[PDB]
């Protein structure tokens, strides 16, 4: 349902890609997006869907634009424009140099030292969950594992009660892959209002949790305000609750459908870190963007001030110019090139936590439930958006084949 072509946009660059409902979604969501890398598709195209915006389709351009924050601003990073304008999460809605003071604070609460700290706890959350599912011979992996494992890890990190999980998870869904019940803005404001009273509790009586640290943080030589803390904690929550959740489901759908790749990791456990990186390339799932700060000529194309440009992080590693046979999963692939965690100054802060959650899941699942497949008669369906995902993943196994360590 398409917006009229802006005067400055050449009509031969039009390709009406809908990022929330792409044409070939039934073939798998990465497959659907990959059509933007067809021979007949330009390196930089314009879609009239979702209010109209640019799309960079190749890794070269995507990296280039994410590096140039002077022209491509993160102030309005979501499509549609109404979402992007409402978007005020910290650090992401800020450009350097102002972004950097807030990024250091956020890195304090989810960075590698924190993750090393939480290793034994992450390991047990996984094992407890899997040992509980193991004798049942079946699960809906998205809501039985993919959702609770990362989210309990985050609630742990944030010092938040697991009672609040249903409320919170719903809100984050609306911001990346909404049904239509709430706009981005009201979903975001709901999350903010959840966090305000907790932030104000913890400014006064400090702490070791992510919220306490953020609420007591110092930025620009001053205390962080309750409103800044809120904009940052909201982002950490969205980060903590929606991407890994979705990625685990892509990777497990794949392993469920490929006994060979399972047995490779079963037989060669040391390969699991390398396998994790190649899964991150193949089932890359993020796509947001930037907004033009001024009129600018970019690879032969005149971009105007206020134009929005989708720079799909997902597409870089599926680009056949960056990786040979991109849709093929090769755990021994020699140079794994992707931008799954982003590129430029907003490079994912949670990527060390994310890899840990992924690698612990692969290790602990295949150690206990080595053999499993898609439930008979089931057809897996994907969804698309800022963060694409899997709607459901019913898995089955013979409990007799399962192990206890
Ligand atoms: C598979 C897992 C994940 C993927 C693929 C992913 C992807 C990304 C991407 C592509 C960006 C850059 C977005 C942009 O440039 O606009 C980003 C940023 C960010 N991510 Fe992640 N993410 C993951 C997990 C996490 C986790 C677990 C957290 C934990 C809180 C997290 C927190 C953040 C934060 C705070 C930023 C903003 C950094 C900044 O703006 O400076 N992410 N993520
Ligand atoms: C695009 C993101 C994945 C990234 C910045 C966002 O707003 C996210 C949706 C959460 C954060 O990690
Ligand atoms: K904004």
Curated annotation (Swiss-Prot):
<comment type="similarity">
    <text>Belongs to the cytochrome P450 family.</text>
</comment>
<dbReference type="Pfam" id="PF00067">
    <property type="entry name" value="p450"/>
</dbReference>
<comment type="pathway">
    <text>Terpene metabolism; (R)-camphor degradation.</text>
</comment>
<dbReference type="GO" id="GO:0018683">
    <property type="term" value="F:camphor 5-monooxygenase activity"/>
</dbReference>
<dbReference type="GO" id="GO:0019383">
    <property type="term" value="P:(+)-camphor catabolic process"/>
</dbReference>
<dbReference type="GO" id="GO:0020037">
    <property type="term" value="F:heme binding"/>
</dbReference>
<dbReference type="InterPro" id="IPR002397">
    <property type="entry name" value="Cyt_P450_B"/>
</dbReference>
<keyword id="KW-0408">Iron</keyword>
<dbReference type="InterPro" id="IPR017972">
    <property type="entry name" value="Cyt_P450_CS"/>
</dbReference>
<protein>
    <recommendedName>
        <fullName>Camphor 5-monooxygenase</fullName>
        <ecNumber>1.14.15.1</ecNumber>
    </recommendedName>
</protein>
<dbReference type="InterPro" id="IPR036396">
    <property type="entry name" value="Cyt_P450_sf"/>
</dbReference>
<dbReference type="GO" id="GO:0005506">
    <property type="term" value="F:iron ion binding"/>
</dbReference>
<feature type="binding site" description="axial binding residue">
    <location>
        <position position="348"/>
    </location>
    <ligand>
        <name>heme</name>
    </ligand>
</feature>
<dbReference type="GO" id="GO:0005737">
    <property type="term" value="C:cytoplasm"/>
</dbReference>
<keyword id="KW-0963">Cytoplasm</keyword>
<keyword id="KW-0560">Oxidoreductase</keyword>
<keyword id="KW-0349">Heme</keyword>
<keyword id="KW-0479">Metal-binding</keyword>
<dbReference type="InterPro" id="IPR001128">
    <property type="entry name" value="Cyt_P450"/>
</dbReference>
<keyword id="KW-0503">Monooxygenase</keyword>
<comment type="function">
    <text>Involved in a camphor oxidation system.</text>
</comment>
């Amino acid at each position: 349902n398409l917006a009229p072509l802006p005067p400055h946009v050449p009509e031969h660059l039009v390709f009406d890609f809908d990022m929330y409902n792409p044409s070939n979604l039934s073939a798998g969501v990465q497959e659907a997006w990959a059509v933007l890398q067809e021979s007949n598709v330009p390196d930089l195209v314009w879609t009239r869907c979702n209010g109209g915006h640019w799309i960079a389709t190749r890794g070269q351009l995507i990296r280039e634009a994410y590096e140039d924050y002077r022209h491509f601003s993160s102030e309005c990073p979501f499509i549609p424009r109404e979402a992007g304008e409402a978007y005020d999460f910290i650090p992401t809605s800020m450009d350097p140099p102002e972004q950097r003071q807030f990024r250091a604070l956020a890195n304090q609460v989810v960075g590698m030292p924190v993750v090393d700290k939480l290793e034994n706890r992450i390991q047990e959350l996984a094992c407890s969950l899997i040992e509980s599912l193991r004798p049942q011979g079946q699960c809906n992996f998205t809501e039985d594992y993919a959702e609770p494992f990362p989210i309990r890890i985050f609630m742990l990190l944030a010092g938040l009660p697991e009672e609040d999980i249903p409320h919170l998870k719903y809100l984050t869904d609306q911001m990346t892959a909404p049904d239509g019940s709430m706009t981005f803005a009201e979903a975001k404001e709901a999350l903010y209002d959840y966090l305000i009273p907790i932030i104000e509790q913890r400014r006064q009586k400090p702490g070791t949790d992510a919220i306490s640290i953020v609420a007591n943080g110092q930025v620009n030589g001053r205390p962080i305000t309750s409103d800044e803390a809120k904009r940052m904690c909201g982002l950490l929550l969205v980060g903590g609750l929606d991407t890994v959740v979705n990625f685990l489901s892509f990777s497990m759908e794949f392993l469920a459908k490929s006994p060979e790749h399972r047995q490779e990791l079963i037989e060669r456990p040391e390969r699991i870190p390398a396998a994790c990186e190649e899964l991150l390339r193949r089932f890359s799932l993020v796509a947001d963007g930037r907004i033009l700060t001024s009129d600018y000529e970019f690879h032969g194309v005149q971009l105007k001030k206020g134009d929005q440009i989708l720079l799909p992080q997902m597409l870089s590693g599926l680009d056949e110019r960056e990786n040979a046979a991109p849709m093929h999963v090769d755990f021994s692939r020699q140079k794994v090139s992707h931008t799954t965690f982003g590129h430029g100054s907003h490079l994912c802060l949670g990527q060390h936590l994310a890899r840990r959650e992924i690698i612990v899941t692969l290790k602990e699942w295949l150690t206990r439930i080595p053999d499993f497949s898609i439930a008979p008669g089931a057809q897996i369906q994907h969804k698309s958006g800022i963060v694409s995902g899997v709607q459901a993943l019913p898995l089955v196994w013979d409990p007799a084949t399962t192990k206890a360590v």
